[PDB]
Design an enzyme around this catalytic site. Sequence first.
Site, PDB file in Angstrom:
ATOM      1  N   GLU B  12      28.552  71.681 -42.778  1.00 54.55           N
ATOM      2  CA  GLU B  12      29.577  72.013 -41.797  1.00 54.55           C
ATOM      3  C   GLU B  12      29.353  73.367 -41.124  1.00 54.55           C
ATOM      4  O   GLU B  12      29.802  73.575 -40.000  1.00 54.55           O
ATOM      5  CB  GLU B  12      30.972  71.921 -42.416  1.00 54.55           C
ATOM      6  CG  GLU B  12      31.366  70.487 -42.725  1.00 54.55           C
ATOM      7  CD  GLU B  12      32.556  70.378 -43.654  1.00 54.55           C
ATOM      8  OE1 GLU B  12      32.766  71.306 -44.463  1.00 54.55           O
ATOM      9  OE2 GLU B  12      33.261  69.344 -43.596  1.00 54.55           O
ATOM     10  N   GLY B  79      38.841  62.406 -42.985  1.00 57.37           N
ATOM     11  CA  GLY B  79      39.037  60.968 -42.901  1.00 57.37           C
ATOM     12  C   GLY B  79      40.229  60.637 -42.027  1.00 57.37           C
ATOM     13  O   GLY B  79      41.258  61.310 -42.096  1.00 57.37           O
ATOM     14  N   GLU B 174      40.520  70.735 -47.980  1.00 54.81           N
ATOM     15  CA  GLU B 174      40.611  72.207 -47.925  1.00 54.81           C
ATOM     16  C   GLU B 174      41.611  72.768 -46.925  1.00 54.81           C
ATOM     17  O   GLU B 174      41.987  73.937 -47.025  1.00 54.81           O
ATOM     18  CB  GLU B 174      39.261  72.840 -47.574  1.00 54.81           C
ATOM     19  CG  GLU B 174      38.130  72.529 -48.510  1.00 54.81           C
ATOM     20  CD  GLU B 174      37.476  71.202 -48.203  1.00 54.81           C
ATOM     21  OE1 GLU B 174      37.502  70.770 -47.023  1.00 54.81           O
ATOM     22  OE2 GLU B 174      36.909  70.599 -49.137  1.00 54.81           O
ATOM     23  N   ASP B 197      35.023  59.228 -41.297  1.00 52.64           N
ATOM     24  CA  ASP B 197      35.269  57.948 -41.960  1.00 52.64           C
ATOM     25  C   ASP B 197      36.741  57.574 -41.875  1.00 52.64           C
ATOM     26  O   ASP B 197      37.556  58.357 -41.378  1.00 52.64           O
ATOM     27  CB  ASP B 197      34.852  58.022 -43.431  1.00 52.64           C
ATOM     28  CG  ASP B 197      35.608  59.094 -44.197  1.00 52.64           C
ATOM     29  OD1 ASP B 197      36.694  58.788 -44.743  1.00 52.64           O
ATOM     30  OD2 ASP B 197      35.125  60.250 -44.244  1.00 52.64           O
TER      31      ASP B 197
HETATM   32  N1  LIG Z   1      38.221  60.129 -46.895  1.00 51.05           N
HETATM   33  C1  LIG Z   1      38.226  61.461 -47.072  1.00 51.05           C
HETATM   34  N2  LIG Z   1      39.010  61.993 -48.036  1.00 51.05           N
HETATM   35  C2  LIG Z   1      39.004  63.325 -48.204  1.00 51.05           C
HETATM   36  N3  LIG Z   1      38.310  64.259 -47.543  1.00 51.05           N
HETATM   37  C3  LIG Z   1      37.544  63.705 -46.593  1.00 51.05           C
HETATM   38  N4  LIG Z   1      36.689  64.347 -45.709  1.00 51.05           N
HETATM   39  C4  LIG Z   1      36.134  63.354 -44.951  1.00 51.05           C
HETATM   40  N5  LIG Z   1      36.554  62.146 -45.269  1.00 51.05           N
HETATM   41  C5  LIG Z   1      37.448  62.353 -46.305  1.00 51.05           C
END
Ligand SMILES: Nc1ncnc2[nH]cnc12
Lengths: 229, 229
Positions: B12, B79, B174, B197
């Site tokens: 990142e 996500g 975070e 995702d």
């Molecule tokens: N599904 C997910 N859960 C938690 N942190 C994430 N960061 C990216 N995707 C995530």
Amino acid sequence: QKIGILGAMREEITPILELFGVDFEEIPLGGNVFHKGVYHNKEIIVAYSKIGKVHSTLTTTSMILAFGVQKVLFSGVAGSLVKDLKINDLLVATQLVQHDVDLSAFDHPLGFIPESAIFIETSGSLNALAKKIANEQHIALKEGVIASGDQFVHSKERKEFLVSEFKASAVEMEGASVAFVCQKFGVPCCVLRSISDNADEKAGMSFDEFLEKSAHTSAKFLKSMVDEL
Amino acid sequence: QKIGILGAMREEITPILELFGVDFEEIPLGGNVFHKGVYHNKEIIVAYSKIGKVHSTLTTTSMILAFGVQKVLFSGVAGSLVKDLKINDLLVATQLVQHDVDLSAFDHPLGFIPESAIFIETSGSLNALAKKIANEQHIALKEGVIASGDQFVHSKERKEFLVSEFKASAVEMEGASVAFVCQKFGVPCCVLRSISDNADEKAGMSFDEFLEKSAHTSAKFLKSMVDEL
Ligand SMILES: Nc1ncnc2[nH]cnc12
Ligand SMILES: Nc1ncnc2[nH]cnc12
């Protein structure tokens, strides 16, 4: 010598302040109040973090960076996961884990975060001192694993998980994070807990009944350690 | 002016370092490496915290206390919990919650810790700047709630909980803790995320495919903000 003394709740540090019985200067920083005093040639910095991993990580980091403490002693209450830890019984944490960490989406072991480790260790010297004091005072003191997470545990199902996954003896909400910060900065850490409940369906009612006494039991033991430092 | 720039993973912040393209001094503290540079009359301090609430709380506190940053901009991936946030889409967090906090044993609302609050706010000014930049560049930018916790979410059941309990638009590990620390010290904070995702059963495989691109999308946007500061 500069010693940091931490609890999570006001109830956990009130007996600490009273037991030391010295004048404290109140210093605000980062949403916490730090109580600075002198006790037998040692500077002591006392604070409660507020509950949980974020609160306790912040406060411990402030203690180390802003106040320059050379060791951190944590005192408070915890839930028992094992039959031989009864209400009021004391435990010193030899290892701690963040029991709620879960990256199993990537097939990591539970409790594991990349570039870290599942278990955090504490001070061999301080833990050894604690055991000697307990023995000399005819006090039982378990030396074992503490599981820390951001949930107050009150179910048999979760207890069974903590014991099977991590071989934990007690559960609480700040120990692992305090010990984690101390280790990253090379600061000796001891985590002491007195049992307030059995982390089961009645945990809340037990905690309410025993918080004051268990908090005092832990504080009194912490004081006895400082008296030997 | 002194600006802190944070990510959680090396992936990142790599694009952040590359995009700024200046010389950085590497400074170790508390298990982190801070990259200190000068960019157009501003001192920038860049680091990745490592994943999760304890890591990010520690790093943010170090940034503020040891490096004296006057604002913190966070960039990384998250996500999606909502249909209108597609892979690569950007979100700025207007409010954040620690979704895994549970003191229901004492009948507290989920996410709530005594002496705290369920939701943490971020910088109105920085968020407003982000929206203006996005509009000017014909980029969609959602302004919404981020749920943060110490689990990588990969189930429909947990997604449904986050949306119903907290009205969350995205999930990560975070944001809430970084914003929490900033608020305690009175430091303006902006949390930016790009979707990697859908936080479902295939989240891990999606994350693996899209991490690099989504990380870059967020980093590029963060850079565009700094260019207006
Ligand atoms: N599904 C997910 N859960 C938690 N942190 C994430 N960061 C990216 N995707 C995530
Ligand atoms: N059951 C419990 N769970 C978490 N922290 C606790 N502290 C005391 N009892 C506890």
